[PDB]
Amino acid sequence: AEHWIDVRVPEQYQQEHVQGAINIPLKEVKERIATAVPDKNDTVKVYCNAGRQSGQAKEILSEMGYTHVENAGGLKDIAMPKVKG
């Protein structure tokens, strides 16, 4: 399966977020991933407004010992349905 995580400020989430993502900012992803995705073998796709901060979150998660994290890109790149906050 997969889980999707918005890793930026809620400010993007308010206007639109990938349908099925949860806002877990970069600053906090390190701890909150454990409650969002208790099985770190599950696929985790991170994205943010500019793709970069999801890149950083991916590195944080890789340090936390994830096996299937991926930076999807930036919010613009993900071609899933989106919804507002």
CATH number of residue 65's parent domain: 3.40.250.10
Annotated catalytic residue within 5, 44, 48, 57: 48
Instruction: List Cα–Cα distances, 35 to 11, 32, 40, 52, in angstroms.
Output: 22, 5, 11, 23
The yes-or-no answer on residue 48 being catalytic is: yes
The single-letter DSSP state of residue 1 is: -
Elucidation technique: NMR
Residue with tokens 């796709």: 45
- Cα–Cα dist 33/15, whole Å: 23
Range of the domain at 79: 1-85
Q: How many domains does the chain have?
A: 1
Q: Are 4 and 79 in contact (CB under 8 A)?
A: no
- Cα–Cα dist 78/73, whole Å: 7
- Contact residues for 42 (Cβ-Cβ < 8 A; gap 6+): 1, 2, 3, 68
- Beta strands per DSSP E along 1-85: 2-6, 17-18, 21-23, 43-48, 69-74, 82-83
- Cα–Cα dist 37/52, whole Å: 21
